[PDB]
Design a protein around this nucleic acid. Structure first.
Lengths: 247, 121, 247, 121
RNA sequence: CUCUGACCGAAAGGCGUGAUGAGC
RNA sequence: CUCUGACCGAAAGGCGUGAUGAGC
């Protein structure tokens, strides 16, 4: 049992979100900065992982040609058009010293994407030793945010379903609770596919159903280690299609 | 008797429990069902909580005993989750109930808790 | 001349601040997380590079020994501590998989520290081409903040000294300009040692002395590349003793 | 004549500058000193600006010509910063001076701008 | 300091192991 | 959209290449 493993899982999911923040931050800098040398590449490569991968392995404009752009694995339209904008760009010239420091920034953002993947692998595997039922229902990541929002597995296992349904809506909840404003129907559980994409008019009842099952899965994970997730998912599948039915 | 049943409840005590629930329903206030019951315990609004002993999966009511020890609320088992439910005035069954205000039952509540105070210790 | 190198120094100095933002964020996370395995190291290694270097090269409590701690290069009372706190700790146990992912985070932050020193040296060497005088008076880092706040060397070289004294105080200045409230006596130049460490009653006068000299230093860097910073650094020493003399 | 002197001011014109500043001081409003002058230019409050040609370093006033061509304000050179300083009514020197409102000197201002429009083109 | 609480469905049935209402 | 603007010092002196006053 141990019993601190849920705390480390929490740390890791929070870590994942923290890592996400810095990637978004460094990438932005990377784009603003390499744009002094090559302004157009920005709109061409809206996908960060691709933009960072470019700067890192290509660098200065002089190094591009047809060759290196395929080994980068970008499509054929994308290549000739970036290849075109180059030979023709209005960007400032960079020295070898100048481009090297921005290539070092890219190299680091790449290390980070790998770190991000490492964390996401850890959470996914650790989640099988911590709350298998939660994983089965909502996915590894979502179950971690739930544990995380509640403060731990035990703290989750103690909550009424109605608290679970609103975890991660804390602002909305406390607003309602004070001024009698209309309550949130969902917190983080909105991510759950069946909720996030469904007629807006059945989203509330699905959240209510899912939270009920999440409460039972959490109590079992914590107090037994018994595996009921299959019944649970099926009984949930049942109740959703039944909701889907009449509306 | 599933592990979450921490002590043995005389066939008698069980019977008063169910009728403490019944008159507390008409002359008093109760919250039926595990979520509402749990809510009641954390708000210290619970005089007593009845836990059915046939719950499936049994882990559903497994958070009540410790949560009750922490707020120092007395809790008793009854044999049947369907019986418990009719005692509280509902067509279906109920895995737990809490009495908010005992109404005309305060006598019964008191003595359930005294006879309970022992079985624990 | 090129003429875009001043925009590159700007990105670099903004980047240097971002890297600092992320290092903090991730180091705060490193400590919360590793503290689950080893609570007591937190206070014992208050200095970040030291905590990171530890988690990264030591890891699990089972590897701590008199040997590896000296090779990590920390003092004698420290290492006499950490050895008691360690075997007697109240922190949770960690498997191999659990500690491997937290050490990955600490290998990352380290890359980040090396990236920060790379930026710090790139600014320092770049400043020597871009604004040698500006660098001499105030140091490369601060000189880059000035250029950054101004919007470029040219913009900064078009400014009155009164603007330069307040660069970085943008809100307090506007608020003084709108309502009429007392003006800021300094912006970023507040870091100049002779300002922030001097008797509070002389700070405005040293600010206004320094702003004076920076405006002249920026005009020379931009319009000539002539090098006057020796006299400028003396006339300023004089004026600062002359200021200290009477107070 | 240092590179920031972009045209050759006839010994006469210079002398009409110094007494335009002189009378615009008493009968009008001027700004003495390079930081006030530059402030007066960016605010379009400069009618004319005079710039000494003996400034050391010469880069202290080197931003005044470009900045003046963007706001269109006419500028002219006088040979001495001490002279310019006195003409402005201060004991020390002045690297540049701007007349805000000419006062009883506007006549001189206009013709300085006219003769200067030429030395540019 | 952490929503509501018995109805829903044309019926078959669903529903306190949570109906209904509800601002991630 | 980006402070103030001729004083300060017991004097020697400093000071529009910025005195004084002023909420990084």
């Amino acid at each position: 049992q141990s019993g601190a493993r849920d705390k480390m899982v929490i740390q890791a999911i929070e870590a994942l979100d923290d890592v996400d923040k810095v990637i978004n931050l460094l990438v932005a800098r990377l784009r603003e900065w390499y744009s002094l040398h090559f302004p157009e590449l920005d709109e061409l490569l809206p996908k960060h992982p691709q933009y960072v991968a470019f700067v890192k392995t290509v660098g200065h404009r002089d190094n591009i040609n047809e060759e290196v752009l395929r080994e980068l694995g970008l499509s054929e339209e994308k290549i000739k058009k970036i290849l075109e904008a180059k030979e023709k760009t209005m960007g400032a010239w960079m020295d070898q010293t100048d481009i090297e420091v921005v290539r070092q920034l890219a190299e680091e953002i790449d290390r980070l994407y790998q770190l991000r993947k490492k964390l996401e692998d850890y959470i996914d595997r650790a989640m099988d030793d911590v709350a298998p039922n939660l994983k089965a229902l909502v996915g590894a990541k979502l179950a971690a945010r739930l544990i995380s929002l509640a403060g731990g597995l035990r703290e989750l296992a103690m909550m009424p379903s109605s608290t679970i349904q609103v975890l991660g809506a804390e602002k909305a909840l406390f607003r309602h609770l004070r001024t009698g404003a209309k309550p949130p129907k969902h917190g983080v559980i909105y991510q759950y596919p069946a909720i996030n994409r469904s007629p807006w008019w059945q989203r509330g009842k699905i959240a209510r159903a899912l939270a009920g099952k999440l409460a039972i899965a959490a109590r079992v994970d914590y107090f037994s280690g018994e595996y009921i997730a299959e019944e649970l998912k099926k009984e949930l599948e049942a109740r959703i299609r039944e909701i889907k039915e009449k509306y | 008797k599933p592990s979450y049943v921490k002590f043995e409840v005389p066939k008698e005590l069980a019977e008063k429990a169910l009728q403490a629930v019944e008159i507390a329903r008409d002359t008093g206030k109760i919250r039926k069902g595990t979520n509402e019951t749990t809510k009641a315990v954390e708000r210290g609004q619970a005089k007593l909580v009845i836990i059915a002993e046939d719950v499936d999966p049994e882990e559903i009511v497994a958070h009540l005993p410790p949560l009750c020890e922490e707020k120092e609320i007395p809790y008793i088992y009854v044999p049947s989750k369907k019986e418990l439910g009719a005692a509280a005035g509902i067509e279906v069954a109920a895995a737990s109930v809490a009495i908010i205000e005992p109404g005309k039952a305060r006598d019964l509540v008191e003595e359930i808790a005294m006879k309970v105070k022992e079985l624990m210790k």
